[PDB]
Structure formats: structure tokens, C-alpha cells
Symmetry: D2
Subunit: 380 residues, 4 copies
Amino acid sequence: KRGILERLNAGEVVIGDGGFVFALEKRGYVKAGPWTPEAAVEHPEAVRQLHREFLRAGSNVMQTFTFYASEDAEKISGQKVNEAACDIARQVADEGDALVAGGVSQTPSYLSCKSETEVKKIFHQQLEVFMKKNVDFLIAEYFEHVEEAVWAVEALKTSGKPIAATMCIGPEGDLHGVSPGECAVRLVKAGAAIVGVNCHFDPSTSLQTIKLMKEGLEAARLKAYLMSQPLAYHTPDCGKQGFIDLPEFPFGLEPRVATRWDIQKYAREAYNLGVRYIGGCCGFEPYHIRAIAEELAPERGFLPPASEKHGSWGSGLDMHTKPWIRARARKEYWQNLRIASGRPYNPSMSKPDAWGVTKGAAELMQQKEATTEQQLRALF
Amino acid sequence: KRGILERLNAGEVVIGDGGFVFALEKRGYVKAGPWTPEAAVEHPEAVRQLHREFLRAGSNVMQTFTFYASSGQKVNEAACDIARQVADEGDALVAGGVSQTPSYLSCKSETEVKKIFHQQLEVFMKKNVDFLIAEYFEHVEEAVWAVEALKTSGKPIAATMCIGPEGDLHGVSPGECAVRLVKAGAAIVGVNCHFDPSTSLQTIKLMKEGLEAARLKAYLMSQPLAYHTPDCGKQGFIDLPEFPFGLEPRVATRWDIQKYAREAYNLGVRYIGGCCGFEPYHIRAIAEELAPERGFLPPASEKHGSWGSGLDMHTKPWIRARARKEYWQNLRIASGRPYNPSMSKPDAWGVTKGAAELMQQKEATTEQQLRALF
Amino acid sequence: KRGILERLNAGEVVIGDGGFVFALEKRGYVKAGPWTPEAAVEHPEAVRQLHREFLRAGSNVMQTFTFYASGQKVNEAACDIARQVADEGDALVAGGVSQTPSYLSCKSETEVKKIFHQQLEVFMKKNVDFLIAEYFEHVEEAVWAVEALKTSGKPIAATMCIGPEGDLHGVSPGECAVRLVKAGAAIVGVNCHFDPSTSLQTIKLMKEGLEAARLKAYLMSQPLAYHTPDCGKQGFIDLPEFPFGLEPRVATRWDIQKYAREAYNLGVRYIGGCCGFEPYHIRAIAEELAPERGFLPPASEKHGSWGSGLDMHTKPWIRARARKEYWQNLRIASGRPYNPSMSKPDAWGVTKGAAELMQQKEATTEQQLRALFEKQKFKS
Amino acid sequence: KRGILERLNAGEVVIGDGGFVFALEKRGYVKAGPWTPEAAVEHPEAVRQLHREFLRAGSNVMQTFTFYAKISGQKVNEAACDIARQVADEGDALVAGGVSQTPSYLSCKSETEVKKIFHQQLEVFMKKNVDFLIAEYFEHVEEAVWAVEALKTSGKPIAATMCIGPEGDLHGVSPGECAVRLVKAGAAIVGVNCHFDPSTSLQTIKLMKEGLEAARLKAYLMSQPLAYHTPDCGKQGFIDLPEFPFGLEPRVATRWDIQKYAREAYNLGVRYIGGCCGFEPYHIRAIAEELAPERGFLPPASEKHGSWGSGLDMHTKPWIRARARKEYWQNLRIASGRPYNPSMSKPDAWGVTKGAAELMQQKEATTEQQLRALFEKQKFK
Ligand SMILES: [Zn+2]
Ligand SMILES: [Zn+2]
Ligand SMILES: [Zn+2]
Ligand SMILES: [Zn+2]
């Protein structure tokens, strides 16, 4: 039916899908650590059910549950995985008003300062499969260096398919110091029709960057579509690198998970800021996606199927012998309720793990500190 | 092959399943408010996938995704079937359940109310369920009736309740409950839902006591909330302001569950599961913690590790340094919401009669008299 | 003028003084650990100024800044300073005695009782307005103190730093009050080791015990000004933050007013404070019960009702704070987002040896666990 | 005998005094109304005891408990300076006269008029022989610069500090620029004070330090921050915070907090380290003890103290004795004791409007209704 660029050009709002990888980990099919997708062949019914839950939630994009392979004889079964995945994706995408998207991300074999040629071959190696499976469009995501991302877009444009590029960096800028605005520019110039940011930072942060990007493009005449797919984790204490530096990553993030109301707020802000491809990254479960779609329903003209088992703002609580519980079926109540953590012995924030060791500072100052205390004790 | 009572008698640890209803709500198949299971026929593949995820997590019980019908009967049947199918795929049994009824509260008489339990029992009889479970009771009075009604089947009966350490809505302490419940024929007794892990085990101790101080003997069962509810006044987390759309933050971590599972086991509980909030990985936490004792790891552990182990690898040193039990067992995880409190006062309405009001007048007057002195 | 018993019998509300010892520690005249009063002779002007600040705050009692000892000169210099300030206003002087190792390593009833008499002497020689056997946990001993003090024929008020649970020997609050009044205490209550809210829970119990025994007496409370919801059983002393990191738990004037109101409504007629109570805290008690007492303490001269002094102020939002409703309901912030709101007490609950046998079973479980993963994962 | 500039030039560390006004408010001598010093004559013994507690704590400066106004106020000011001088004389300390942001400027009252004020106050300070002058509380370099200028008239050393963080001053006059302009205007000592907790306060200093360095101008660094943790200071000082000024209790710093700050301050180059609102005597004592090794002595107040909980060595309880360690107190995340309260609060300021505010609610209201609409339609299918 309608392609990515068409939808956007028609003024439509493209609902993205959520955090596939994390959802499967909690369901028992993906192992935190390597975070690989071999379940697409080991447990297809699981991968399928998830894609369907997102589709039901209103998601318009089924991102392939793929991964870069080549892992060694000297080749890969990982390729069968990737293909099985694209297929499952396509199957579910076909079941609804959705497209399939192939993705590629930050290459370790780059952070070894290899070369644009070598690294770029990777992106092409993956592009192949996406070509063969005839994906609807491509997405370069999970990037902290425009430098590289720019390469990906370039490598992908080869396909002649629409290209979307988000980055996993917030406020400040990328790792080399490049500000968000510059990024967007460079990225669109490199051919990205859709640009934005994904994962690494929570909803609020993520939209701060978008504004900046938005700015950069405006102050350069370049025009493109805005995209955001943030964490569903509240990360106000995120110092840098993303929530990965947070002590709780990735087994104690439970409490930071956003509520449906949190997501609606974000979706509203996003839309009002101009973002038109609104999705989510790690942490986004099906109901989170459903929150985006319900919040913008008035604008889109419809409710996703999943809303069948839902209500406006607690409405399904109209009924219920208890008055105080029925009194919660109101937008005003949920939109303002400061929910409790349930953990009075825990802080509300944590210092990142950064350990970008200054150096002997973790020695000298420490030593100097130790000595100062003793000299001090002496004067006593 | 092995039945519920056999497993327990063999010294085995029966891993229960989790919070089916809540999980489907987040997945988009159960509407909050009515909380009904019509998806067993509208979207069987969904119900099936969940039962399988729990089974994969190490769960030994597939509780029927049934309910009480005013058809809804086809629903119930379709559910039991799906349950049985998945149960058959692994080392698990199917269990039929019944709970508190609106009619009890509409003081409807032991006869009338008891008919309900029998109406549901029928289906469970017809779909050869391995055993029965009377859960979700705030009044032993009624629960006792359920057990009685169910014993009719001659199948093993487990009765859990949602009551804190202070007894039920009739003042009956936990110990008394357990007694009355086992005397009524429950071979397995314990507490389910309405109270987080820690609390839930406080009651068990009490129940344990009551049975011990009465010579009655039975098997202990617990299936708590996966929600930290230290601010729960009384009448479960349902009275909490955040119920049921803002509980996110209180969700337990796998480490929280392991701790609980360990305490539970050490306290003597042998049927350890979970209620609302329990997702597949939570069940997997129970099974992994007691793996040494049980002799095996559930399949789901294939995509897991001991205590963060899968983090051994990872170019980052500080992240690799997290692959340790000591690290996760002691880490005080942050809420990520610095503008929110860590606790909330329940909603549970008590007064507005004489009090309440004056809890406004005398205060108003005091302020004025005070202002006067100035 | 009016004696202790008279005041109470006239229906009057006796405002107690605050946490002398802690206030002088923060001012630099008392050292924590020994917490002795040798400043009464080393820096009398300091001790004097404090007694005066409380007196100005509305306090009706100047408790001697005495100790257990030259230490005797100290004690005498203290009583004198007390008397001098007490004389400057509508206040009485009170001599106190508390739980000391005479009972610790168990020095009988004879030996221990001699102590109380040794201190009583000085109090007799200064003709204090009344006696207070405070800071107690074992009624057993407290009962001895009251007995030893009755010897003086002066009124005896009694207070124990104990919870809604019961004395250290295990006897419930009600029993305590009974035993204490029977032993001759005309005034009974609890002081220290627990925050406002808790402290009043016990009073209710005590109140009960006396009522359910026909015994009649006056109720007294002098709690901590520290919020201690996480207090386990042996006072805030077992709390990790004792005594150098209690800052955040300090009560606000509004907190104190609330307490004073509850206390009064419950029947307490001798309302004061212990550790943590600064002058303005005392002033909060007196202002809250002002309507009832008929007057405001002098210190109110530099104060206002409920933020009233904020009427003025070019800023509207700041002027909008000059209201009881605003301060009585404002959930003040901690300002420490990286800190928990509660802490587990320290009291090694004698596991002994298990504190080292359980920590074994855990170690072993982890290894056995690690073992299973090794086997099962290395074979599909 | 040693003057302010001498001390600093000798490499010495000048310990400032604390939050006099707030301390007297809690003690019952300063009304939270307009915060005036009439107690210097109504209750001298109180003012005296405080100055002495700071002096005992190691403070080297007794700032006059003065105030800008006929109102029986000049006698007040004089009585204050005297009390100050008396206590200053009792130890190794100097007296300092201060002036701050005044209502004039905020009503736009010509540099001439406003400047007269500073001179009116200067007079008294001249007459009582204050050792040096201080321009604290300044939210506009523009004005502060005027103060310094007005004060240089005295030929006495001039110290500058302001209540405005890294964002810079109201006029977008970044911290660096401020320091520059301030020293150029004659300030020998520059820094920040009031309305920014320890951590923040030192962030600005670094900036100022920078500005001066990148301009060859040289001067002495000074900081006297709040003893209140204000991570939520949305913008304006803690005055915009909901809890100001009667619910700040919980944010109060601990002695350990202060030591940390004092250490950072010193390491950053600050040599005049004091405190503003919230600083009690023991807070000052924390600064002095932390830098004791460097200074060569402990203030008298340390007589009733210990290194890091040392006084806990004794105590029948093992777990309590185990707390007599720097490592324990320096790392202990102290609890708030208020599980029903948040750890942060949004400041009070106000986005005027007439647009999407009287409307934010409108579009929101309408969206909810349209949303509600869609729900009815589909549950009919
Ligand atoms: Zn992600
Ligand atoms: Zn439940
Ligand atoms: Zn005390
Ligand atoms: Zn200040």
C-alpha cells in the first residue's frame, strides 16, 4: 500500500515499534550480554507473537530482529537467522497497516580505527539481505559518531530505498564533539530523508536534542522528517554514554520504566515539536506503543486494535464497587499523580559508572587525601 | 506422570506460574476494569505464548485463564484446553481456580454462593485438571466454603489467601485461617497476591505457626505481588493510588525475586510462585535460585547467566565488573524519579463522620486565635 | 511563684525546654562521645545564652546541664546558671538523673541507688523546683530512681526513651506508667530515642495502662526532633547517621506544631523536646498551644503566625506562602536525590557465628548454581 | 595585627564566618519578616555569643550584623560594629563591613542616587575602623561594580562576591566577565555567595577563575555558599524554592558535606572560604578542620570534637564504634527520614502568558474529548 515517504508526505504519523530485544530477554529468548537474535529460528513463534503485539498496539514498523554475523570453515548460520527474522517480520507486517525496516548500527570494527572502506563493507554485507528480502526502507541507528553514521547512510543509499537515521546521543553532542544540529545536517546531506535520535536517553532528554537537530536543519535550509525512539527508562541521572553507564544497567532498571501516562506526555510533546515518526527503544513494551497511538489518535483519526482492551484515561475503572478506585478513571488524576517508588531505602538517582579513569588521580589525590587526613589527625 | 501431591511428597519444589492477567493487559489482550479472559477464544495464540513463556521459565503449573461466567463457558473451556496443551509440552500440571465472589459480599448464603464454586468445578472436572486452587480470598469464612465445595472433586486442593499478617476482613488471624483451611481439606495452604514478597512471607510464618500449634500438617504456598508495597495500609495494593496504571516503579527485579525465593524455601514453603506483576523472568528467578536444590535449570536459563555473568564480555570494564552476585544483590537501584516520593498513603475510606470535618474547623479556629495573639 | 504541680493543677500547659547537649555540640562547647557539661565552668556565657534562648522561646523548665562526676563544681556551676535564667522568667529549674552502667554491668539496687542519691544531694542543696528521672529504658531501674528521688519530697516527673513496644526488660508501656506512678511519679511520659509521631503512640498506651488501673498522673513527652520512621528498637542511636549525619531528619517548626497539637489533644500537659530541639522548635510548641494558654512567648516577637512575615516581599509566589494551609501541607524535599529516605539500623542481632554460617550457604549456593550453568550450557 | 591582604599574601587561608541572620532567626532574635538586626541593641548578649561561636569555630572574619535602612537604625548599625570589633579582638580575626543589592537599582534609581546609599553605609564603617569591606549579595555586576567603586573611596581592601551562578548574571553577564569587571573596578578579592549550594557555587568560581586568567587580571578567590543542598534550584536562588525559608531543614549540609566542599574549594584555588545562610558554627569548624593540615592548626572549637567521628572510639556498642572513621562518614548516603516526600521540588517562577496557557488546557481538554469519542465508536463494531 503506502510507503514510508508517502505516509509522511500525506501528513500521517508513523508509529514505530518498541524495544524488541529487551522484551524477549524478559520473556526468555534473548540473552543479555551478546543480545543476539538466534531465536528467530530457535523459537519463531515467540518472535512472531511480539511483532504481532506491537502491530496490535498501533506500530507501523516491524524492524527486523536482525544482527551483524560473520562469526565463523569461516562463515555463518547467523545469516539464516537474519533471513528467518526478516521473513517473520514481513509476515506480521503484512497482517496489518505496517512496513518492514532493515537496520544497521555502530560497528565495533570501527572503534579500532579500521577504515571507512572496511567498515563500510559491513553495512553492505547486511544491506544485501535487506535487498533480497525487499525491505520497505532502511534505518541507521544506534550511533554515537556521526562520522560513522554518515558512512552508513551513504552505504545504504546505494539501495535507493528511503533512509532514516537516529543517533544514540542526547543534549551535548556526539563523541567527537559534533553538536546535534551539525549531525542532522551532515546526516540529511548524506541522504537521510528521516532523522532523529534513538535509545540512550529517556523521553524528556531525547526531545531536547530533537529541538536542537530541528534547529540545525532549519538554520541550513535542509529539510527532513524528525524521528525519535527513546528509552522507556527515566534517566535524569544519566551523565553520559547512555544508561549503559548507569549502575542498574541492565538488570535493575525496573523502577525507571515509564508508565503509559509518561509515554502519552512524551508522544504529545514529540508531536507538538514536529516529530512525525514516533516510536521507542529499550524498555518499550506493547502498551507503551499503544500509549503513543492513543495520545495522537485524535490527530490520526483512529485507535489501534489493542485499544479494544483499554480505555481513555483509566475509564475501565468506571465500574468497581469501590468509589476511590472509580475516582481514578480520570485523565486529570493519572496525568498528575506522582507515583511512588515503593523503595524507601533506595535513592532516586545514581552516579554513572564513567570510570573514564582520570589516571593516577585515582591514586595521587586519593593518596594525597589519605595523607592530609593523617596530618590533620596529627595536629589533633 | 507426577501429580501435585507426589511432587511435594518426593521433596520436590513446585514452581508456580506468574501474573497471567496483568501480563496480557500490558500485551493488549485483557482490558483493565473487567479483567476478563475472552482472549482465550479471540486470540488463543497470545494466551498460548504466555503459558509457554512461563513453562519455559520453569513454572510447573499452568493455572487456567478462566473466570466466572454470568458464551463465557466456551471461553473457560477454550482456556483450560490451551492450558492443558502447554502443560503437556513440559513437566507441568494444569490447575483450575476459583476466588472471592461478588455474591458473598451481597450476603448471599452459603448455599447460593457454594453453587458458584460448583458451577466452575464442573468444567474443571470435565477437562481433567490435575488439581484445584482456592485463591484470592479475604474471608476464610468463604474460602473454607470453597475448599469444601471443591473437595467434592476428590482432587488435591490448595487454598491461598490475600490477607496480611493481621488476619482477614473478619479478624481471623493467619494461623487460625491455615488451620480452618486445612481442616476443611486443603492439602496445600498459603497466601496469594495483595502483598509484596517480604510481607507475604511474614504471614506464612504465622500460618506455619498456627498449623504447628495444632498438629495439623500441610504444604506451604506463596504467590505474592512482584510489586514493592511497604506503604500498603491494608486491603492490598488495590487501595494504593497507583493501582493499577502507575505501579511500574514498584516492580521487583530478578534479584528481588531470588532473595524472596530463598527466604521462602528456607522458611519451608514448597510451592513458590507469583501473582500480579510476575513476568516470565521473575519465575525464572525463583527456579534459578533454587536450582542447586532442585538439581536443574529451567530451559529459559539458556538465554541467561548466573548473576550478570553474560556481562563477562563487554569492552567496558565497569560493566564487566557488574557480573557478580555480590554486586547485584547489594545494589540499591534508583527510582529515576527525583520528584516523586518513595511511598504513598492508601486511599481506603474511613471517616468524614464527626471527625474529618472538625479536622478543619478546630484547626481553622486555632490559626485565628493564634493570629490574634500576634 | 507557681510550682510544677500547681501549674499542672491549674490546667496550665508546661512547656519543656529542648535538646541542650546537642545544641551546644553544634555551637562548639560539648564533645560527642563523652557528651559532658564542663562548659558550665569553662564557658558559662554560652550555657547561659542557650538557657535564655529556650526561656525566650516559651520554655517553662530549665533542666540542669548536669552530669555524673572537679565534676561536682561543674554540676553546681550548672545548677546556678540554670537557676539564674529560670529566675529571669516564668520558669522552674529541674534536676535530672538517667540510666547509667550502675545498672549496665548490674551493680545491684543498693549500689546503683547510691548514685541517684549522690546527685540528689546537689539538687537538694540548690533547692531545684522538681526532679526528673529521664533517659530510661528499664522501668526496673527507673522505678529505683523515682524511689531514690522521692526521698527529697519534691515532685517527680518520669520519662523513658522507649517505644510503643516496651522497656528493655520487655515490660509494656502501660505497665511502665503504672509501676512508675505507683513508685511515686506525679508526672509520667517518654522522652528521646524516638521521633514525635512514635513518641505519642506510646503515650496513648501509657495513658491506657494508667486508666485501666485507676492510677492518675500527668502526661509528659520530650521526643527527638528527628524523623525516625526507620528506627528499629534501640533508639536513633542504632541508626547509621547517629550522630553526625542526622541533619536531614530534623523537624521543621510546622512538624513540631503538628506534634504539639496531637500531644495536647491526647492529654499531654508537659510538652517539650529532646535531642534535636533548637529554640524555634520550642517556640513552635508554645505558638501552637497559644490559643489555649492565652499568650505568646517573647520569641514570637521576631516571628509570625504561619509564614505571615512573608506578607511583604515583592515576589507574589513567595507572599503566597504566608499561609498555614501552605506550610502544613507542603511535602518538603530532601535535596539529596542520590540518598535513600530510610536506613536499616546497625544492631547486630546475635546471629553470631551464623553471621558466618549463612554467609557460607549463600557462597556455596552460588557455586553450585555456577556449576549447573556450566554443564547445561555447553551442550545446546 | 595581620590585615586581610597580608594574610592572603602570606599564603594563609582566611576562614570566613557563617550565616548570622538565619542562625539568630532560629534562636529567636531575628524576625523572618524583613530580617533586620535590631537585636544588636535589644539583645547584644545574643549577637555577641554568636560572633564568639564562629570565632571559636575558626572563623577569621566577623562580618558586621548591619543593615541598610529614618528608623532607629544607625544606633543599631553602630552597636553591631562594636560588638563585632569586640569579639574580633578576642581572637585572630578581622571585622568586615558589608553592603548589598538594594531596592533602588531594582526600581532603576540612577547610579548617583543608588551610589549614595553605599556611601551612607560606608561612613559608619569608616568611623568604626572596619578592617576591610565586602560587596556580597549582588545579582547584577552592573550594580556590584558601582558598590566596589563607591567603597574603594575608603582605600580599604575590597572583597567581592555575588548571589548568581554559572548562567552568569541576570544581564547575561557570564561569571568570567563579572570577575573581570569586578576586579577592574578595584576588587582585590572576588567570588560568589548566597543562593547556590556548595557544589554549584564552586562551578561558577572555576568560570570566574577562568575569566580572570584569560585577561591577565589577578585576584583572590572567595566563596560563601548556602549550607543547603539545592540541586533543584531551577534557576533563581533557593528563594524561589517552595521550602524557603521555613522548610529547608532537610537540605542542611552535614559537617562532612562541608569538609568535602572546603577541600574542593581549596584545591580549586579559593583562599577565602566561608559560608552563607544555613552555616552554623560546626559548619565553619568543618572548613577549618579540613584545611588544618595546610593551615598548621585546629580552631579552638575542635577541643570538643574529633577527626572523623573519633569521639565514637569509646562506646560499649561495636557498630557505633565502627563509625569513627573518615571512610564511613565520607561515603555514607544519609537518609532523609521522610519517605512520603520527594527529594526535589520545582521552583516557584511564572511563565506569564495569554496564549497556549489559557490554551494549553484548551487543546488538552479538546484532545481528551476527541479521544473519548473514538473509544465509543469502536466498541460498537
Ligand atoms: Zn535500545
Ligand atoms: Zn493477583
Ligand atoms: Zn537526648
Ligand atoms: Zn545567605
